[PDB]
Symmetry: C2
Subunit: 47 residues, 2 copies
């Protein structure tokens, strides 16, 4: 089961899922991706 949390560190429009994943790993998550028309980085991990 997957849980999500918006990144605290990601700056600017999320244009590249991989960059978001890397920032999210620095925040303690397993990965992440960009979501929405607002292009925000959302970190993911197993609940």
């Amino acid at each position: 089961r997957v849980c999500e949390s918006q990144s605290h560190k990601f700056e600017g429009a999320c244009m590249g899922d991989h960059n978001c994943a890397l920032v999210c790993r620095n925040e303690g998550f397993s990965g992440g991706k960009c979501k929405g028309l607002r292009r925000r980085c959302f970190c993911t991990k197993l609940c």
Copy 2:
């Protein structure tokens, strides 16, 4: 740090946040609330 996961048990459209919270507690989360244009139940817990 809070995380979110769409409910796996909640039936249909989410009207009452309290109902969603109780359903989500049965899924092992601390709470939950109805969100989105298509009113769905999202469970929350500390990650």
